[PDB]
Design a protein around this motif. Structure first.
Motif, PDB file in Angstrom:
ATOM      1  N   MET A 199       0.785  -1.283   0.000  1.00 16.42           N
ATOM      2  CA  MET A 199       0.000   0.000   0.000  1.00 16.42           C
ATOM      3  C   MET A 199       0.801   1.310   0.000  1.00 16.42           C
ATOM      4  SD  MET A 199      -3.429   1.212   2.204  1.00 16.42           S
ATOM      5  CE  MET A 199      -4.172  -0.490   1.465  1.00 16.42           C
ATOM      6  N   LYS A 200       0.527   2.147  -0.995  1.00 12.73           N
ATOM      7  CA  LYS A 200       1.098   3.475  -1.033  1.00 12.73           C
ATOM      8  C   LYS A 200       0.399   4.299   0.060  1.00 12.73           C
ATOM      9  CE  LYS A 200       1.136   4.868  -5.732  1.00 12.73           C
ATOM     10  NZ  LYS A 200       1.263   4.719  -7.270  1.00 12.73           N
ATOM     11  N   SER A 201       1.211   5.120   0.714  1.00 18.89           N
ATOM     12  CA  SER A 201       0.836   5.958   1.828  1.00 18.89           C
ATOM     13  C   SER A 201       1.502   7.326   1.679  1.00 18.89           C
ATOM     14  CB  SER A 201       1.407   5.316   3.104  1.00 18.89           C
ATOM     15  OG  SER A 201       0.540   5.617   4.141  1.00 18.89           O
ATOM     16  N   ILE A 202       0.866   8.369   2.178  1.00 19.83           N
ATOM     17  CA  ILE A 202       1.487   9.685   2.279  1.00 19.83           C
ATOM     18  C   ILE A 202       1.097  10.303   3.624  1.00 19.83           C
ATOM     19  CG2 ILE A 202      -0.492  10.886   1.207  1.00 19.83           C
ATOM     20  CD1 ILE A 202       1.564  12.661  -0.388  1.00 19.83           C
ATOM     21  N   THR A 203       2.000  11.076   4.238  1.00 17.05           N
ATOM     22  CA  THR A 203       1.636  11.837   5.429  1.00 17.05           C
ATOM     23  C   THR A 203       0.831  13.087   5.019  1.00 17.05           C
ATOM     24  OG1 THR A 203       3.617  13.216   5.575  1.00 17.05           O
ATOM     25  CG2 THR A 203       3.775  10.998   6.499  1.00 17.05           C
ATOM     26  N   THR A 204       0.118  13.655   5.988  1.00 14.29           N
ATOM     27  CA  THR A 204      -0.610  14.867   5.765  1.00 14.29           C
ATOM     28  C   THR A 204       0.340  16.014   5.468  1.00 14.29           C
ATOM     29  OG1 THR A 204      -0.866  15.300   8.173  1.00 14.29           O
ATOM     30  CG2 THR A 204      -2.677  14.086   6.997  1.00 14.29           C
TER      31      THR A 204
ATOM     32  N   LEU B 122       1.709  23.228  -2.960  1.00 13.80           N
ATOM     33  CA  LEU B 122       2.679  24.117  -3.569  1.00 13.80           C
ATOM     34  C   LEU B 122       3.049  23.762  -5.022  1.00 13.80           C
ATOM     35  CD1 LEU B 122       5.003  24.710  -0.476  1.00 13.80           C
ATOM     36  CD2 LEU B 122       3.126  26.197  -1.303  1.00 13.80           C
ATOM     37  N   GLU B 123       2.567  22.628  -5.535  1.00 11.27           N
ATOM     38  CA  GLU B 123       2.885  22.172  -6.898  1.00 11.27           C
ATOM     39  C   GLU B 123       1.907  22.725  -7.916  1.00 11.27           C
ATOM     40  OE1 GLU B 123       2.757  17.860  -6.494  1.00 11.27           O
ATOM     41  OE2 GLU B 123       4.511  17.979  -5.104  1.00 11.27           O
ATOM     42  N   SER B 124       2.290  22.703  -9.197  1.00  9.04           N
ATOM     43  CA  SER B 124       1.401  23.219 -10.251  1.00  9.04           C
ATOM     44  C   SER B 124       0.236  22.247 -10.553  1.00  9.04           C
ATOM     45  CB  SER B 124       2.201  23.612 -11.505  1.00  9.04           C
ATOM     46  OG  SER B 124       3.533  23.093 -11.441  1.00  9.04           O
ATOM     47  N   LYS B 125       0.530  20.964 -10.737  1.00  9.08           N
ATOM     48  CA  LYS B 125      -0.557  19.977 -10.933  1.00  9.08           C
ATOM     49  C   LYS B 125      -1.426  19.831  -9.662  1.00  9.08           C
ATOM     50  CE  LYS B 125       1.759  16.190  -8.814  1.00  9.08           C
ATOM     51  NZ  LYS B 125       1.781  14.724  -8.541  1.00  9.08           N
ATOM     52  N   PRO B 126      -2.755  20.047  -9.763  1.00  9.89           N
ATOM     53  CA  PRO B 126      -3.652  19.879  -8.623  1.00  9.89           C
ATOM     54  C   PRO B 126      -3.723  18.427  -8.206  1.00  9.89           C
ATOM     55  CG  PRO B 126      -4.727  21.041 -10.424  1.00  9.89           C
ATOM     56  CD  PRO B 126      -3.508  20.398 -10.978  1.00  9.89           C
ATOM     57  N   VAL B 127      -3.829  18.185  -6.914  1.00  9.36           N
ATOM     58  CA  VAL B 127      -3.873  16.833  -6.410  1.00  9.36           C
ATOM     59  C   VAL B 127      -5.338  16.503  -6.233  1.00  9.36           C
ATOM     60  CG1 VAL B 127      -1.562  16.522  -5.519  1.00  9.36           C
ATOM     61  CG2 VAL B 127      -3.225  17.873  -4.223  1.00  9.36           C
ATOM     62  N   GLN B 128      -5.678  15.241  -6.482  1.00  5.63           N
ATOM     63  CA  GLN B 128      -7.035  14.735  -6.365  1.00  5.63           C
ATOM     64  C   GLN B 128      -7.137  14.084  -4.992  1.00  5.63           C
ATOM     65  OE1 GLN B 128      -9.932  14.268  -8.492  1.00  5.63           O
ATOM     66  NE2 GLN B 128      -9.248  14.193 -10.636  1.00  5.63           N
ATOM     67  N   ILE B 129      -7.949  14.686  -4.126  1.00  2.00           N
ATOM     68  CA  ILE B 129      -8.174  14.202  -2.782  1.00  2.00           C
ATOM     69  C   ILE B 129      -9.630  13.771  -2.736  1.00  2.00           C
ATOM     70  CG2 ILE B 129      -8.165  14.767  -0.256  1.00  2.00           C
ATOM     71  CD1 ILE B 129      -5.972  16.897  -0.846  1.00  2.00           C
ATOM     72  N   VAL B 130      -9.858  12.572  -2.174  1.00  2.44           N
ATOM     73  CA  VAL B 130     -11.176  11.997  -2.007  1.00  2.44           C
ATOM     74  C   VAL B 130     -11.451  11.734  -0.529  1.00  2.44           C
ATOM     75  CG1 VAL B 130     -12.766  10.079  -2.779  1.00  2.44           C
ATOM     76  CG2 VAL B 130     -10.863  10.913  -4.275  1.00  2.44           C
ATOM     77  N   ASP B 131     -12.501  12.367  -0.004  1.00  2.00           N
ATOM     78  CA  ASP B 131     -12.834  12.285   1.427  1.00  2.00           C
ATOM     79  C   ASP B 131     -13.941  11.259   1.492  1.00  2.00           C
ATOM     80  OD1 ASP B 131     -13.633  14.829   3.945  1.00  2.00           O
ATOM     81  OD2 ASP B 131     -14.007  12.640   3.999  1.00  2.00           O
ATOM     82  N   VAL B 132     -13.693  10.146   2.190  1.00  5.14           N
ATOM     83  CA  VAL B 132     -14.609   9.000   2.170  1.00  5.14           C
ATOM     84  C   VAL B 132     -15.385   8.889   3.494  1.00  5.14           C
ATOM     85  CG1 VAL B 132     -13.363   7.707   0.394  1.00  5.14           C
ATOM     86  CG2 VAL B 132     -12.860   7.196   2.843  1.00  5.14           C
ATOM     87  N   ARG B 133     -15.344   9.956   4.291  1.00  8.10           N
ATOM     88  CA  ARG B 133     -16.147  10.057   5.518  1.00  8.10           C
ATOM     89  C   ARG B 133     -17.644  10.153   5.209  1.00  8.10           C
ATOM     90  NH1 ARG B 133     -14.114  15.072   8.642  1.00  8.10           N
ATOM     91  NH2 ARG B 133     -14.037  15.822   6.486  1.00  8.10           N
TER      92      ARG B 133
ATOM     93  N   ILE C   6      -3.631   9.862  -9.800  1.00 16.56           N
ATOM     94  CA  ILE C   6      -3.414   9.279  -8.489  1.00 16.56           C
ATOM     95  C   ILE C   6      -4.433   9.923  -7.568  1.00 16.56           C
ATOM     96  CG2 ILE C   6      -1.885   9.025  -6.538  1.00 16.56           C
ATOM     97  CD1 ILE C   6       0.456   8.948  -8.070  1.00 16.56           C
ATOM     98  N   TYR C   7      -5.085   9.115  -6.727  1.00 12.55           N
ATOM     99  CA  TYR C   7      -6.116   9.601  -5.815  1.00 12.55           C
ATOM    100  C   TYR C   7      -5.694   9.450  -4.372  1.00 12.55           C
ATOM    101  CZ  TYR C   7      -9.024   9.920  -9.924  1.00 12.55           C
ATOM    102  OH  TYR C   7      -9.528  10.220 -11.171  1.00 12.55           O
TER     103      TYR C   7
ATOM    104  N   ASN D 224      -9.799  -2.369  -8.743  1.00 16.68           N
ATOM    105  CA  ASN D 224     -10.518  -1.822  -9.879  1.00 16.68           C
ATOM    106  C   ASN D 224      -9.619  -1.019 -10.837  1.00 16.68           C
ATOM    107  OD1 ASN D 224     -13.578  -2.455  -9.661  1.00 16.68           O
ATOM    108  ND2 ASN D 224     -12.991  -1.975  -7.563  1.00 16.68           N
ATOM    109  N   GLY D 225      -8.299  -1.145 -10.649  1.00 15.73           N
ATOM    110  CA  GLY D 225      -7.323  -0.526 -11.519  1.00 15.73           C
ATOM    111  C   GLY D 225      -7.103   0.966 -11.346  1.00 15.73           C
ATOM    112  N   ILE D 226      -7.385   1.467 -10.150  1.00 14.99           N
ATOM    113  CA  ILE D 226      -7.312   2.895  -9.876  1.00 14.99           C
ATOM    114  C   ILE D 226      -6.165   3.091  -8.913  1.00 14.99           C
ATOM    115  CG2 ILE D 226      -8.432   4.860  -8.789  1.00 14.99           C
ATOM    116  CD1 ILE D 226     -11.139   3.145  -9.744  1.00 14.99           C
ATOM    117  N   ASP D 227      -5.316   4.048  -9.245  1.00 17.59           N
ATOM    118  CA  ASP D 227      -4.110   4.315  -8.471  1.00 17.59           C
ATOM    119  C   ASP D 227      -4.511   5.203  -7.279  1.00 17.59           C
ATOM    120  OD1 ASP D 227      -1.473   4.665  -7.592  1.00 17.59           O
ATOM    121  OD2 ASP D 227      -0.857   5.679  -9.480  1.00 17.59           O
ATOM    122  N   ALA D 228      -4.402   4.657  -6.079  1.00 11.90           N
ATOM    123  CA  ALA D 228      -4.886   5.329  -4.862  1.00 11.90           C
ATOM    124  C   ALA D 228      -3.852   5.227  -3.805  1.00 11.90           C
ATOM    125  CB  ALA D 228      -6.249   4.727  -4.387  1.00 11.90           C
ATOM    126  N   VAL D 229      -3.783   6.250  -2.934  1.00 12.31           N
ATOM    127  CA  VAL D 229      -2.737   6.343  -1.899  1.00 12.31           C
ATOM    128  C   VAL D 229      -3.447   6.658  -0.578  1.00 12.31           C
ATOM    129  CG1 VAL D 229      -0.765   7.692  -1.148  1.00 12.31           C
ATOM    130  CG2 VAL D 229      -1.053   7.162  -3.625  1.00 12.31           C
TER     131      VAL D 229
END
Length: 103
Positions: A1-6, A14-25, A58-59, A79-84
């Protein structure tokens, strides 16, 4: 499992490409504030929303504390979706700088 800290996910603001964040609450939880521009897809509705994800991005998956989100990461990768997983979820992210909608 890919993981990232907050901290590392915040750094991506701070990057140019927007990050896709999904809140599953749940809606009850997200109503109290969520990360601006996050897609709000409660976990129990994720199987009805595969169309929200595409195989090119990446989600980053966030929940209250990082547990439900790990399950969604597994589900999405099957389901073939790249998620972290976002380690520590909203507990780690904090309650500052969050959005609520008035409409």
């Amino acid at each position: 499992m890919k993981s990232i800290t907050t901290d590392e996910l915040k750094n991506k603001l701070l990057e140019s490409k927007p990050v896709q964040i999904v809140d599953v609450r749940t809606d009850e939880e997200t109503a109290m504030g969520y990360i601006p521009n996050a897609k709000l897809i409660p976990m129990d509705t994720i199987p009805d929303n595969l169309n929200s994800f595409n195989k090119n991005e990446i989600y980053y998956i966030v929940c209250a504390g990082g547990v439900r989100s790990a399950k969604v990461v597994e589900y999405l990768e099957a389901n073939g979706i790249d998620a972290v997983n976002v380690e520590g979820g909203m507990h780690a992210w904090g309650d500052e700088g969050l959005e609520i909608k008035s409409i």
